Design a protein around this ligand. Sequence first.
Ligand code: PF9
Ligand code: MG
Ligand code: ZN
Length: 314
Amino acid sequence: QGLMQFTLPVRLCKEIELFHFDIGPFENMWPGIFVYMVHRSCGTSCFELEKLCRFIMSVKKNYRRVPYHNWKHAVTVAHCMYAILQNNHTLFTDLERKGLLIACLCHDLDHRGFSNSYLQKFDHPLAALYSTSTMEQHHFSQTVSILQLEGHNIFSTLSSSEYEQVLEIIRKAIIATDLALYFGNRKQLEEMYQTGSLNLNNQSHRDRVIGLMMTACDLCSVTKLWPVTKLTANDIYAEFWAEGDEMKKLGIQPIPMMDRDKKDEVPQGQLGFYNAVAIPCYTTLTQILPPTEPLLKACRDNLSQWEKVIRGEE
Ligand SMILES: Cn1cc(-c2ccncc2)c(-c2ccc(OCc3ccc4ccccc4n3)cc2)n1
Ligand SMILES: [Mg+2]
Ligand SMILES: [Zn+2]
């Protein structure tokens, strides 16, 4: 370092600030994109460059070549968080800014392209070790492993205190990406907001808000321009349908979402998901963090494209 400011070509330098940015198909640029976002979100001082780079490269190595839950997904979720942090400058601690971009990069480490359900039904060792949020507790465990490799402690300068706090922000952040947890979390946030009890000085309230951000970042493929959204849906179903196939081999009819024989109903299934999860998610997030409203608007836009698909208008 430390007069060594990372820069992106003009188009990326401008579009990276927007919620709907797509990080693109040039895999070798994704590390530079992430370091750019850390340096602007957090500072050039937050992390030792050599250690950050070594961390990023080990994190990348520990994502598998699955259709959806891959390194690209990791970096895409990190960028959505960067857009939130950058649109809500003053709402967030120095520790939170440090923790949340790492949490996002690490949140699906060593994902195998299967649901927590399938691990339970297959009777995978991870399901014995972690009874709920099975893959999510795994992802946090892989983060700690990588943080513990020689020359990988990016938090080296934090006090004992701060270090324990940052790893606790990351742990909760990662556990929150378990969508089964999202539903209750958002209902409580919605009630706290409407009864006016929401208080960002209550750590237990901050936790829930960061949980909702995590869901929002995780789901952020539904907040992209339609051609990105449509092509990403292909990837997520490529995994679900393989898991369906694996269910059939255990002697279990999978749910329709995972049955490649019920492909035809993708459009209607996306509609449910926009109505039941995505729209409520970005709606409650906008109420709590007004500047995140572009994510709701882009989500609404994509619901209407799926309505178009159904009507045979595409
Ligand atoms: C956490 N997470 C990410 C995503 C996601 C979504 C879109 N693009 C990228 C990522 C999802 C998700 C949720 C539902 C879904 O399909 C819903 C559904 C329900 C009944 C069906 C019946 C027949 C056919 C299809 C059917 N699809 C597909 C993906 N979960
Ligand atoms: Mg996950
Ligand atoms: Zn994810």
